[PDB]
């Protein structure tokens, strides 16, 4: 269907590709290496529960007062 040149990526000569840099002494920084710096939220979960309760309650209070 397609020629071998198209499959292998070169007509006559295979060109050398420059390898990827590593930056020895530190972690790689790529779009896929970001969980090393940003994990899932784990520090303020209980505060999340409390604040969701208080937000629901205060919103319900003011909505009922406005409606009434």
């Amino acid at each position: 269907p397609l020629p071998n040149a198209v499959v292998q990526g070169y007509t006559s000569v295979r060109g050398p590709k420059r390898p990827l840099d590593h930056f020895y002494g530190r972690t790689p920084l790529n779009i896929d290496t970001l969980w090393h710096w940003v994990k899932f939220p784990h520090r303020y979960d209980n505060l999340r529960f409390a604040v969701c309760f208080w937000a629901f309650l205060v919103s319900a209070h003011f909505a009922n007062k406005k409606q009434r």
């Binding site: 590593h22 020895y24 972690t27 790689p28 896929d32 090393h36």
Partner: protein, 53 residues
Amino acid sequence: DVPIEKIPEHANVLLKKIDACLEILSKDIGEVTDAEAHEMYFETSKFQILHIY
């Protein structure tokens, strides 16, 4: 103004220079071994990673 006996001195100088070059260029960087660079090779395995202890 340049006699023929003075040539091997220049040859010695250039040999010293090219030897100082080649002793460095003979070294090359090997394959990377940092696990942080190859952790996605294990992340992308057909099975989940077993942390066995």
